[PDB]
């Protein structure tokens, strides 16, 4: 890494205070950060790291929070989160899995998805009008970008495309130590074959895999997790 | 409270000298009793790293080759734990230097990967096999070259160890050293006889794996 | 980009502010100009910069792929774009997505690009065929032999030829003045960093805002741009 945490650091959390900086420095840093990586679910460890480092609100919303038979409450929700973002604290909006609301469709029998993507174009014009004197920081990541529309990835909207196929061995040691340091550890719990093999096989959301190993240690029969739940959690999930 | 079901394992873990000697000298059967993890007082005694307790257990004549349900020998415990004197006692009693655990690893993998100089020199001195491969077909040079253990690779090359062990994918330890941008391990292994022609199943050369012009000094050190 | 703005003011800015030159000079309407060369900088930032000084909109054709799969099945659809151009009279048209060095097969790429060549043929046949409103022009952008094919499709009747100028001295001073009027000594730093592109100075500013923001300086000093020169010389 060393460029992901630095670019997201100075482009996300440094402008998160004294709003006058956005126009004191001139060109406001782009707020659009598009993560990738379809092996695992992912998109959670960094949202938690920001949720613990930065002390602010976080109004997370699943990508299908407004996909209903109605059309309202869209600009009401995003407008209320905008006005509280520029009113109380610039909460970071987490819009994950935009492929459900970004799928191509020409037929008019499914005019609900086309209608809510026309609302997505309405708020697209809103964020077009939200480039001057506004407190907004919306992170938008997904697992597949081959089906994403060109209007979303247009320059000026999403100017950061960070790729994360696999973390390096040092980031493996850190991503395993940050979760095994709190949980029950032992001498059989080793990071050598688990730094070698998970570096060969492509796998994201390693923290979620260790949490699944916690679901394999939730029996309370064995007080300390061992290599059986680790390798079994590797071959299963 | 208690981290283990057997009391002798909580005593061997908590370092209760006089209480472990009172319990074992009061009942010799408690020494070799098995727990749910198929471990005895020797496994936890070598785990905590106490000299007098493992010298009492090994003094009475506890089987040094007692494996758990997976196959974790006590030498993997003293080597992987990072305890010099415990490895001195286990090697002093005749432990298997090439024991096979669940994944077929040897104490040279865990000892060498943890950058333990004295444990690696003392294990290899007793007659350890440098070319011993686990179930994943990986030796200790993949891990030592993956974590940046330069001096460990060097002292492994003191005992005439091979540097062209193919992994389960086919990557040599040079691919794992150059993958992490280890310039010193690349110049050392290539300067000592590393074969760059051996490819993996992905058909990737060590020059293409490394970036930033490192393949240029790789081929430069190969031709030169 | 001194040659592009100096040669573009009388081609684009003629129907904008001084239409009397059409009668007092006896000249016709320039239908457009094709920009050939390395698409480093100035293909879109300058079209939208001059298009921003004109306060006009920007309409794209998007003759590349994905239009036959995302938008139904696909169609020609240039007359509706000419009605939208009729409503928004100041409509600047420019090809940017198809501008690539990959269209050099001459077997299938000459056809796939020849569909856009047909699009600009019929656009030059409607524009050259009749003129209802002003400020209707098209700008081409290609890198491969298709430039010589554009010369094969423009028989010297209504066309303009402007080559991509290198980052000359005045070509950097004037583009830094025009790009500086929207927002320290910019002259000497505009003199002491020759490069390969036109917006390289803007790249120096973007690579300097993180040091003016890191050091919390009230004004960008010469040392900040001096570091940004090393930054662009390490990224480039």
UniProtKB/Swiss-Prot annotation, chain A:
One of its GO terms (cellular component) is proteasome regulatory particle, base subcomplex. The keyword Ligase does not apply. One of its GO terms (biological process) is proteasome-mediated ubiquitin-dependent protein catabolic process. GO terms for molecular function: ATP binding; ATP hydrolysis activity; proteasome-activating activity. It comes from the Eukaryota. ATP binds at residues 37-44. The modification N6-acetyllysine is found at residues 228, 232. Its main location: cytoplasm. It is found in: Cytoplasm; Nucleus. Keywords: Acetylation, ATP-binding, Cytoplasm, Nucleotide-binding, Nucleus, Phosphoprotein, Proteasome. Component of the 19S proteasome regulatory particle complex. The 26S proteasome consists of a 20S core particle (CP) and two 19S regulatory subunits (RP). The regulatory particle is made of a lid composed of 9 subunits, a base containing 6 ATPases including PSMC4 and few additional components. Interacts with NR1I3. Interacts with PAAF1. Interacts with TRIM5. Interacts with ZFAND1. Component of the 26S proteasome, a multiprotein complex involved in the ATP-dependent degradation of ubiquitinated proteins. This complex plays a key role in the maintenance of protein homeostasis by removing misfolded or damaged proteins, which could impair cellular functions, and by removing proteins whose functions are no longer required. Therefore, the proteasome participates in numerous cellular processes, including cell cycle progression, apoptosis, or DNA damage repair. Belongs to the AAA ATPase family. This is 26S proteasome regulatory subunit 6B. It comes from Homo sapiens. The chain holds residues 170 to 406 of 418 of the full protein.
From Swiss-Prot, chain B:
Residues 37-224 are annotated as: Interaction with RELA. Keywords: ANK repeat, Apoptosis, Chaperone, Cytoplasm, Nucleus, Repeat. It is found in: Cytoplasm; Nucleus. Its main location: cytoplasm. ANK repeats lie at residues 1-34, 35-67, 68-100, 101-133, 134-166, 167-199, 200-224. GO terms for cellular component: cilium; cytoplasm; cytoskeleton; cytosol; microtubule cytoskeleton; nucleus; proteasome complex. GO terms for biological process: apoptotic process; negative regulation of apoptotic process; negative regulation of DNA damage response, signal transduction by p53 class mediator; negative regulation of MAPK cascade; negative regulation of NF-kappaB transcription factor activity; negative regulation of release of cytochrome c from mitochondria; negative regulation of transcription by RNA polymerase II; positive regulation of cell growth. It comes from the Eukaryota. One of its GO terms (molecular function) is RNA polymerase II-specific DNA-binding transcription factor binding. Tends to be up-regulated in cancer cells with RAS mutations, including lung cancers and adenocarconimas (at protein level). PROSITE patterns: ANK_REP_REGION, ANK_REPEAT. Residues 1-69, 169-224 are annotated as: Interaction with RB1. Pfam families: Ank, Ank_2. Changing residue 180 to A: Abolishes interaction with RB1. Residues 1-35 are annotated as: Required for nuclear localization. Part of transient complex containing PSMD10, PSMC4, PSMC5 and PAAF1 formed during the assembly of the 26S proteasome. Stays associated throughout the assembly of the PA700/19S RC and is released upon association with the 20S core. Interacts with PSMC4. Interacts with RB1. Interacts with CDK4. Interacts with MDM2. Interacts with RELA. Associates with a CDK4:CCND2 serine/threonine kinase complex. Interacts with ARHGDIA and increases the interaction between ARHGDIA and RHOA, hence promotes ARHGDIA inactivation of RHOA and ROCK. This is 26S proteasome non-ATPase regulatory subunit 10. It comes from Homo sapiens (Human).
From Swiss-Prot, chain C:
GO terms for biological process: negative regulation of DNA-templated transcription; negative regulation of programmed cell death; positive regulation of DNA-templated transcription; positive regulation of inclusion body assembly; positive regulation of proteasomal protein catabolic process; proteasome-mediated ubiquitin-dependent protein catabolic process; regulation of transcription by RNA polymerase II. The keyword Nucleotide-binding applies. ATP binds at residues 37-44. One of its GO terms (cellular component) is proteasome regulatory particle, base subcomplex. Its main location: cytoplasm. The modification N6-acetyllysine is found at residue 69. One of its GO terms (molecular function) is ATP hydrolysis activity. Residues 33-236 are annotated as: May mediate interaction with PRPF9. It is found in: Cytoplasm; Nucleus. The keyword Cytoplasm applies. Keywords: Acetylation, ATP-binding, Cytoplasm, Nucleotide-binding, Nucleus, Phosphoprotein, Proteasome. Belongs to the AAA ATPase family. Component of the 19S proteasome regulatory particle complex. The 26S proteasome consists of a 20S core particle (CP) and two 19S regulatory subunits (RP). The regulatory particle is made of a lid composed of 9 subunits, a base containing 6 ATPases including PSMC5 and few additional components. Component of a complex with USP49 and RUVBL1. Interacts with PRPF19. Interacts with TRIM5. Interacts with NDC80. Interacts with PAAF1. Interacts, in vitro, with the thyroid hormone receptor (in a thyroid hormone T3-dependent manner) and with retinoid X receptor (RXR). Interacts with ERCC6. This is 26S proteasome regulatory subunit 8.
């Amino acid at each position: 890494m060393d460029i992901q945490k630095q670019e997201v650091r100075e482009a996300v959390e440094l402008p998160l205070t004294h709003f006058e900086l956005y126009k004191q420095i001139g060109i406001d840093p782009p707020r659009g950060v598009l993560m990738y990586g379809p092996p695992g679910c992912g998109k959670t460890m960094l949202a938690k790291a920001v949720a613990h480092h930065t002390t602010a609100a976080f109004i997370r919303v699943v990508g299908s929070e407004f996909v209903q038979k109605y059309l309202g409450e869209g600009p009401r929700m995003v407008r209320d989160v905008f006005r509280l973002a520029k009113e109380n604290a610039p909460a970071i909006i987490f819009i994950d899995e935009i492929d459900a609301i970004a799928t191509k469709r020409f037929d008019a029998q499914t005019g609900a998805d086309r209608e809510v993507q026309r609302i997505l174009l309405e708020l697209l014009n809103q964020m077009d009008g939200f480039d001057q004197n506004v407190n907004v920081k919306v992170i938008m990541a997904t697992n597949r970008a081959d089906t994403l529309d060109p209007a979303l990835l247009r320059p000026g909207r999403l100017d950061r495309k960070i790729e994360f196929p696999l973390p390096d061995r040092r980031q493996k040691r850190l991503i395993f130590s940050t979760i095994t340091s709190k949980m029950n550890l032992s001498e059989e719990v080793d990071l050598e074959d688990y730094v070698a093999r998970p570096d060969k096989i492509s796998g994201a959301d390693i923290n979620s895999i260790c949490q699944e190993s916690g679901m394999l240690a939730v029996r309370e029969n064995r007080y300390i997790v061992l290599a059986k739940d680790f390798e079994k959690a590797y071959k299963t999930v | 409270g208690c981290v283990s079901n057997l009391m002798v394992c909580n005593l061997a873990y908590s370092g209760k000298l006089e209480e472990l000697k009172e319990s074992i000298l009061a009942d010799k059967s408690l020494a070799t009793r098995t727990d749910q993890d198929s471990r005895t007082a020797l496994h936890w005694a070598c785990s905590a790293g106490h000299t007098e307790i493992v010298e009492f257990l090994l003094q009475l004549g506890v089987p040094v080759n007692d494996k758990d349900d997976a196959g974790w020998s006590p030498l993997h415990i003293a080597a992987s734990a990072g305890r010099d004197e415990i490895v001195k006692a286990l090697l002093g009693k005749g432990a298997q230097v090439n024991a096979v655990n669940q994944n077929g690893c040897t104490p040279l993998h865990y000892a060498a990967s943890k950058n333990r100089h004295e444990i690696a020199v003392m294990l290899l001195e007793g007659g350890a096999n440098p070319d011993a491969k686990d179930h994943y077909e990986a030796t200790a040079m993949h891990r030592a070259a993956a974590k940046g253990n330069l001096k460990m690779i060097h002292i492994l090359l003191y005992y005439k160890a091979s540097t062209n062990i193919q992994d389960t994918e086919g990557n040599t330890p040079l691919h794992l050293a150059c993958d992490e941008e280890r310039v010193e391990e690349a110049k050392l292994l290539v300067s000592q006889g590393a074969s760059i022609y051996i490819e993996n199943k992905e058909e990737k050369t060590p020059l293409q794996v490394a970036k930033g012009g490192l393949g240029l000094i790789l081929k430069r050190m190969v031709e030169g | 980009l001194d040659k592009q703005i100096k040669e573009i003011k009388e081609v684009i800015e003629l129907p904008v502010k001084h239409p009397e030159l059409f009668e007092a000079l006896g000249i016709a309407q320039p239908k457009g100009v094709l920009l050939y060369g390395p698409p480093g900088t100035g293909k879109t930032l300058l079209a939208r910069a001059v298009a921003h000084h004109t306060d006009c909109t920007f309409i794209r054709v998007s003759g590349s792929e994905l239009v036959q799969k995302f938008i139904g099945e696909g169609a020609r659809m240039v007359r509706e774009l000419f009605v939208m151009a009729r409503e928004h009279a100041p409509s600047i048209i420019f090809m940017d997505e198809i501008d690539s060095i990959g269209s050099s097969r001459l077997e299938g790429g000459s056809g796939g690009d020849s569909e856009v060549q047909r699009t600009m043929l019929e656009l030059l046949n409607q524009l050259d065929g009749f003129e209802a409103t002003k400020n209707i022009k098209v700008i081409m952008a290609t890198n491969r032999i298709d430039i010589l094919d554009s010369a094969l499709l423009r028989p010297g009747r209504i066309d303009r030829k402007i080559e991509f100028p290198p980052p000359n001295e005045e070509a950097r001073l004037d583009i830094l003045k025009i790009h500086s009027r929207k927002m320290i000594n910019l002259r000497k730093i505009a003199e002491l960093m020759p490069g390969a592109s036109g917006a390289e100075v803007k790249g120096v500013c973007t690579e300097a805002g993180m040091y003016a923001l890191r050091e919390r300086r009230v004004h960008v000093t010469q040392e900040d741009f001096e570091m940004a020169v090393a930054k662009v010389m390490q990224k480039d």
